[PDB]
Amino acid sequence: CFGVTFKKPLVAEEKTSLEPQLPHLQLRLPHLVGIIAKIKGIKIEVTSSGESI
Amino acid sequence: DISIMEGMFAVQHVHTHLNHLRTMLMERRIDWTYMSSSWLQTQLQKSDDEMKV
């Protein structure tokens, strides 16, 4: 209109959510509980010698 | 795992200083921790207190 140009109003997103990126250390000692559980049940068997004889 | 977590501390230490430098640069100031500033005290002879200004 005349010399000036008119532009439409811009709609705005109401909310934003922040989810930052985190470094991944990738440690291996955690989630190894099964090995500890296996260590718990060694179960060495010893039979008395001389009771039979 | 301990070998990794020992080196992670240096990464965090560098991250803090780099963030401070970014803030100073966005703020139109100078971070004198990252710059020497010892060469220009001899080129133009000024006192220690006059260099702080």
Ligand SMILES: *[C@@H]1O[C@H](CO)[C@@H](O[C@@H]2O[C@H](CO)[C@@H](O)[C@H](O)[C@H]2NC(C)=O)[C@H](O)[C@H]1NC(C)=O
């Ligand atoms: C939290 O644990 C999950 C599951 O172990 C990790 O997600 C895995 O990440 C690796 C590396 O990018 C991928 O290869 C796997 O496919 C992912 N698995 C799943 C189920 O998503 C996640 O990385 C861990 N978070 C941190 C910060 O270490």
